[PDB]
Design a protein around this nucleic acid. Structure first.
Ligand code: ZN
Ligand code: ZN
Ligand code: ZN
Ligand code: ZN
Length: 119
DNA sequence: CGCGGGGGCGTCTG
DNA sequence: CAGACGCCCCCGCG
């Protein structure tokens, strides 16, 4: 089970062996969302299973909003919110309804999900 | 009702 | 592995 292990996983819940550095880099991605960090704040006590999740969450406390709109100059702290809001200025509404008499279009999957719950 | 704003998660690239 | 991009999901508000 380890008589030949060019590489191993660095996650303490795994520590299994691998042979291709890249194929192990791919395996490791599964564990990148299994590392329980915690907030550093004295006004928080949350835990995040990824560095990016914690780093994103930190912005909620710092108030930092580096993603600024080119149109209305609004400021956001998540690229997903900014790109979503971008579609509001771009008129990009690809989430059209599939019901037998509607086809109403939204710029967000969840907006379409709520709309469908109205049917 | 349209959209802000946080949670969780897969994933390519570095 | 981590940093960064993209989405789905859920909730709250004017
Ligand atoms: Zn592993
Ligand atoms: Zn926090
Ligand atoms: Zn804008
Ligand atoms: Zn519909």
């Amino acid at each position: 089970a380890s008589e030949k292990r060019p590489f191993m996983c660095a996650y303490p819940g795994c520590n299994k062996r691998y042979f291709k550095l890249s194929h192990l880099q791919m395996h490791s991605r599964k564990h990148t969302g299994e590392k329980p960090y915690q907030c550093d704040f004295k006004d928080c006590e949350r835990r995040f299973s990824r560095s990016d999740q914690l780093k994103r969450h930190q912005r909620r406390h710092t108030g930092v909003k580096p993603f600024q709109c080119k149109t209305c100059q609004r400021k956001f702290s998540r690229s997903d919110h900014l790109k979503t809001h971008t579609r509001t200025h771009t008129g990009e509404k690809p989430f059209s309804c599939r019901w037998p008499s509607c086809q109403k279009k939204f710029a967000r999957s969840d907006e379409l999900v709520r709309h469908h719950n109205m049917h």
